[PDB]
Amino acid sequence: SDDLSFKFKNFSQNGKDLSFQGNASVIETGVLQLNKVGNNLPDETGGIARYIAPIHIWNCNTGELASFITSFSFFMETSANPKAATDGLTFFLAPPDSPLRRAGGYFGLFNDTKCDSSYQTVAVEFDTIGSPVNFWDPGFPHIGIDVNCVKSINAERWNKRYGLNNVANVEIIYEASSKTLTASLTYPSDQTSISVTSIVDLKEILPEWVSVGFSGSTYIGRQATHEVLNWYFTSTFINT
Amino acid sequence: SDDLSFKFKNFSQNGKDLSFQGNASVIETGVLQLNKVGNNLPDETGGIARYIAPIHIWNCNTGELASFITSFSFFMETSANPKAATDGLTFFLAPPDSPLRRAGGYFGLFNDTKCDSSYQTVAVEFDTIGSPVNFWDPGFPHIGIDVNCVKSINAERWNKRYGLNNVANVEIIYEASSKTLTASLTYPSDQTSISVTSIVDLKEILPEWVSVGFSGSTYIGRQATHEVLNWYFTSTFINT
Numbered sequence: 001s002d003d004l005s006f007k008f009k010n011f012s013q014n015g016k017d018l019s020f021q022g023n024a025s026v027i028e029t030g031v032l033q034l035n036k037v038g039n040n041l042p043d044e045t046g047g048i049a050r051y052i053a054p055i056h057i058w059n060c061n062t063g064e065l066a067s068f069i070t071s072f073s074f075f076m077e078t079s080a081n082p083k084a085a086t087d088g089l090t091f092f093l094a095p096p097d098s099p100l101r102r103a104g105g106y107f108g109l110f111n112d113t114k115c116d117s118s119y120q121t122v123a124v125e126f127d128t129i130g131s132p133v134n135f136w137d138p139g140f141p142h143i144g145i146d147v148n149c150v151k152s153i154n155a156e157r158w159n160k161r162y163g164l165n166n167v168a169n170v171e172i173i174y175e176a177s178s179k180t181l182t183a184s185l186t187y188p189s190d191q192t193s194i195s196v197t198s199i200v201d202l203k204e205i206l207p208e209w210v211s212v213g214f215s216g217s218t219y220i221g222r223q224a225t226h227e228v229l230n231w232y233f234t235s236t237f238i239n240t
Numbered sequence: 241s242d243d244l245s246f247k248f249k250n251f252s253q254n255g256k257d258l259s260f261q262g263n264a265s266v267i268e269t270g271v272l273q274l275n276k277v278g279n280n281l282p283d284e285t286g287g288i289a290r291y292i293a294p295i296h297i298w299n300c301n302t303g304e305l306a307s308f309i310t311s312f313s314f315f316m317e318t319s320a321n322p323k324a325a326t327d328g329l330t331f332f333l334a335p336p337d338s339p340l341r342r343a344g345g346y347f348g349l350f351n352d353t354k355c356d357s358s359y360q361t362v363a364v365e366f367d368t369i370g371s372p373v374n375f376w377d378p379g380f381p382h383i384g385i386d387v388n389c390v391k392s393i394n395a396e397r398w399n400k401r402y403g404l405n406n407v408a409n410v411e412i413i414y415e416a417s418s419k420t421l422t423a424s425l426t427y428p429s430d431q432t433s434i435s436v437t438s439i440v441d442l443k444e445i446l447p448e449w450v451s452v453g454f455s456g457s458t459y460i461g462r463q464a465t466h467e468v469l470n471w472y473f474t475s476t477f478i479n480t
């Protein structure tokens with residue numbers, strides 16, 4: 001496909017256009033839940049949920065690159081210590097058939113801290129627990145752009161909020177010509193915005209076709225669930 | 241999804257977002273080839289090609305029905321007399337996992353001429369051969385709106401033209417509001433067009449999540465390949 005766009009205003013439990021891995025799934029309240037909390041989960045648990053059809057990210061014959069924009073609102077819920085809750089969620093591009101890996105601080109995308117070009121992953125993380133708990137991260141909750149590694153290229157301090165009472169709207173735009181990836185988180189209750197920009201050439205990083213989706217993880221003791229409220233996306237090789 | 245749209249301007253030799261059944265494939269010439277022709281094939285033969293992602297056509301909780309549009313250009317090729325060349329191609333909606341059924345005059349969609357609701361198929365056909373060759377269609381080539389059967393609830397005469405220099409503009413719509421489906425064909429060359437409109441309630445025929453694709457069929461001794469150049473497709477639950 002050259003152009004693609006799909007909007008989910010809700011999420012039905014009988015959906016047929018989303019593949020889930022780990023313990024992610026749509027729930028009765030029509031919410032896309034990325035990770036389950038409570039008992040009977042491994043110490044590092046989480047889930048991935050991606051659009052069933054692989055996106056045509058770049059064309060190897062024309063050399064053309066596709067620009068894209070995606071928006072979604074998510075909220076988080078925790079029972080105990082919020083400031084100490086792990087680990088967050090992610091929006092990512094990767095080979096559509098990539099397995100679910102290590103959860104917790106690795107979000108399900110990476111199996112350890114070693115950076116490897118073979119991941120062909122580009123994720124915009126919303127990390128809720130950093131150093132010293134998560135060594136490789138800055139000393140505070142934040143947002144970052146992950147390129148083939150759990151360690152961001154660039155990041156921004158995020159003062160995380162929990163509860164349905166604090167829904168966050170995210171919007172990511174990747175400008176193909178300037179290779180600029182910009183993601184912003186905005187708490188609508190008060191317009192508390194934040195954004196992390198970066199210049200990454202997806203043509204070098206990602207494969208011809210990739211999946212676009214989400215991932216969410218937490219940790220025993222510091223459990224919290226991360227869930228998507230809706231989603232929008234639009235790809236296009238043909239400029240604007 | 242709630243809203244969805246894509247656009248293929250041509251096709252990738254190694255695509256990842258299409259499902260192929262029968263002898264359907266993308267030829268090295270970047271064209272969707274619904275069916276192939278040759279002495280290595282059975283008497284009745286064809287193929288199916290669908291967008292790998294199931295579309296949400298209607299939602300049983302709100303009783304909502306989506307509206308849609310699909311456009312495409314196609315041409316055909318044959319070593320047989322156009323007059324006698326079979327069988328045509330269709331654009332269809334049906335269970336995402338519909339097995340490849342009998343081809344020939346049955347477009348890969350039907351077992352035989354018996355009308356069955358268990359098909360849950362809504363196709364728009366571009367039939368090149370009717371009676372006497374096939375004891376069920378009009379005695380000439382035509383287009384038609386098929387609902388759960390290879391027998392059109394409505395049809396229009398179709399003066400088929402062959403070859404790349406005789407490509408055709410099909411523009412199918414479905415205004416959910418009024419429950420009317422309407423196919424269209426325009427031969428760009430001299431700007432002449434035909435159509436068919438038939439009120440068909442998709443909610444009473446198709447499952448919530450259906451597939452969208454094409455099919456091309458042919459018969460021994462009258463073999464022809466049917467190919468699509470491009471394919472736009474949009475659908476949305478918020479009317480329009």
Ligand SMILES: CO[C@@H]1O[C@@H](C)[C@@H](O)[C@@H](O)[C@@H]1O
Pocket residue numbers: 044086087103104105106129133134218219222
């Ligand atoms: C051992 O624990 C470390 O901190 C936890 C909060 C998680 O991020 C886990 O994946 C990481 O390895």
Ligand SMILES: CO[C@@H]1O[C@@H](C)[C@@H](O)[C@@H](O)[C@@H]1O
Pocket residue numbers: 284326327343344345346369373374459462
């Ligand atoms: C003998 O063949 C009949 O006519 C051909 C044109 C095809 O429609 C075939 O499927 C049908 O059985």
Ligand SMILES: [Ca+2]
Pocket residue numbers: 087105127128129130134137
């Ligand atoms: Ca972290």
Ligand SMILES: [Ca+2]
Pocket residue numbers: 327345367368369370374377
């Ligand atoms: Ca026929």
Ligand SMILES: [Mn+2]
Pocket residue numbers: 125127137138144150151152
């Ligand atoms: Mn981080």
Ligand SMILES: [Mn+2]
Pocket residue numbers: 365367370377378382384390392
């Ligand atoms: Mn017919």
